[PDB]
Amino acid sequence: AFELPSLPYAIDALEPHISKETLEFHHGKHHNTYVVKLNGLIPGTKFENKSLEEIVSSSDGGVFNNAAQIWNHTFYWNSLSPNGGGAPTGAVADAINAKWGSFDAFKEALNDKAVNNFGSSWTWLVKLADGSLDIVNTSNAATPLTDDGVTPILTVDLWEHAYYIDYRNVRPDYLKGFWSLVNWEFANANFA
Amino acid sequence: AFELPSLPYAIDALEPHISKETLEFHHGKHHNTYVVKLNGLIPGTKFENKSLEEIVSSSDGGVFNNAAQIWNHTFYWNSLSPNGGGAPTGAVADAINAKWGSFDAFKEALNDKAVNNFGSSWTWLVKLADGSLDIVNTSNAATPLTDDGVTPILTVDLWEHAYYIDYRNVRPDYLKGFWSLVNWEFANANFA
Ligand SMILES: OC[C@H]1O[C@H](O[C@H]2O[C@H](CO)[C@@H](O)[C@H](O)[C@H]2O)[C@H](O)[C@@H](O)[C@@H]1O
Ligand SMILES: OC[C@H]1O[C@H](O[C@H]2O[C@H](CO)[C@@H](O)[C@H](O)[C@H]2O)[C@H](O)[C@@H](O)[C@@H]1O
Ligand SMILES: [Fe+3]
Ligand SMILES: [Fe+3]
């Protein structure tokens, strides 16, 4: 059975960019719920003996929604860090310059894609088969994990539950918080 | 251009089922934004002389999302009332009995459809061409308004911004709030 992974930091380690209350609800309730739901759905199908990744890449309906959300949220927590934020570094910093010319241009590009991602969704930084970086948006539970030759490197949850408590309807403010927490170490690990 | 309709009741008239704060944000911010965005999209276009309903029936992309959302929210505010809630009455009450056998069975059926309506969505009570009632779900900005032979009678906003302030992640509690506010007068009006 799948388990809710531990948060990689203290529930108040992302303050004041993402509050303790948001973390307890988002990770403690929302993330957990997907875990419970998936476990409830798999026994009795050809999924109970497969990994989360295998499942997301071979399912649909409720099995996929819950499984993918589990994967998406775990990737999301890793994309944040009390030690992140600021300018990118290492491989990813240069890759960002290679694609967009500058970190700033990349930042405005991603913010534009995220603020305009309609409804419940996710905005991703991915590495394409050609080796370049790019920004893609997914709806609901969809994820680039299912795109062949596409490697997820960083993600930002744009479902309203991810920011409503701290920023209400202002995604731009939420995004400023995201840039203050972005985990470049996780990005680079995923990049290399 | 289009304008934000006034709320059909005092900003605190839905307490304690839906907070004054939720209405301030939901209607004053979210709904309003849909109006400004549309107004910013239609000038010098084939949609500048059209009525709201006409636009939702002949658009896609950004124009559709914004227009339909303006319509859905206006329909939603009308589906609530400080003097609603309780047992259904008139034509709708009897039509409800005709389809589900009982109001309680209907309530459980709608609750089920609403709680499982994945992502940003709407759950609708609609009247079909054969005069019967039924429950349907739409995602993001989709609406029964564009379905031939389908007459919307009541709707519940399931986007997280509709209830996150007052109920956080618990849709069932939000739904109990809905049932204490359901505007049966509006329902019968739409039904007849
Ligand atoms: O896991 C339950 C179902 O979730 C999805 O369907 C629900 O959410 C949809 C919107 O995202 C609604 O259109 C639908 O009516 C709901 O039942 C999923 O598509 C289904 O396959 C799941 O069984
Ligand atoms: O109105 C702007 C656009 O909104 C939608 O597209 C955005 O939101 C989608 C998810 O709902 C994303 O997939 C997409 O990447 C975003 O640009 C709509 O589908 C577009 O036609 C609108 O132009
Ligand atoms: Fe989330
Ligand atoms: Fe809404």
Q: Which residue has the tokens 């930042």?
A: A107
Taking CB atoms and an 8 Å limit, are B164 and A159 in contact across chains? no
Q: Which residue has the tokens 């927590």?
A: A77
Count, residues in chain B: 192
Token pair recorded at residue A115? 């603020």
Chain A nearest-CA distance from B9, in A, is 23
What is the side-by-side strand order in the sheet with A121-127? A133-139, A121-127, A151-157
- A128-137's contacts with Cβ under 8 Å and 24+ in sequence apart are A132/A95, A132/A98, A132/A99, A133/A92, A133/A95, A133/A96, A133/A98, A133/A99, A133/A106, A134/A99, A135/A109, A135/A110, A137/A113
Number of domains in chain B: 1
Domain of residue B150 covers 1-192
End-to-end CA distance of chain A: 30
Q: For A69-100, b where at least 16 C-beta lie within 10 A, e where not — what string?
A: bbbbbbbbbbbbbeebbeebeebbbebbeebb
- Nearest-angstrom CA–CA distance, A146 and A54: 10
Instruction: Provide φ and ψ at A139, rounded to 5°.
Output: -105, 145
Annotated binding site of A for Fe cation, which residues? 26, 73, 157, 161
**Which whole-number Å values give the CA distances from A21 to A42, A83, B132, in the listed order?**
31, 20, 45
Kindly state the DSSP code that residue A96 receives in the 8-state scheme: H
**Per-residue H/E/C for A7-65:** CCCCCCCCCCCCCHHHHHHHHHHHHHHHHHHHHHHCECECCCCCCHHHHHCCCCHHHHH
**Which whole-number Å values give the CA distances from A67 to A50, A63, A79, B172, in the listed order?**
11, 6, 19, 23
Probe residue for ligand 2, chosen from A110, A113, A115, A117 as the CB with the greatest number of ligand atoms within 8 Å: A117
The amino acid at residue B121 is: S
- Nearest-angstrom CA–CA distance, A93 and B144: 47
Q: What is the resolution of this structure in A?
A: 2.0
- Nearest-angstrom CA–CA distance, A115 and B120: 15
Q: Is the peptide bond prior to A5 cis by the omega test (within 30 degrees of 0)? A: no
How many other C-beta atoms lie within 10 A of the C-beta of residue A44?
7
For A133, the 3-state DSSP assignment is: strand
CA of B30 to the centre of ligand 1 (A): 25
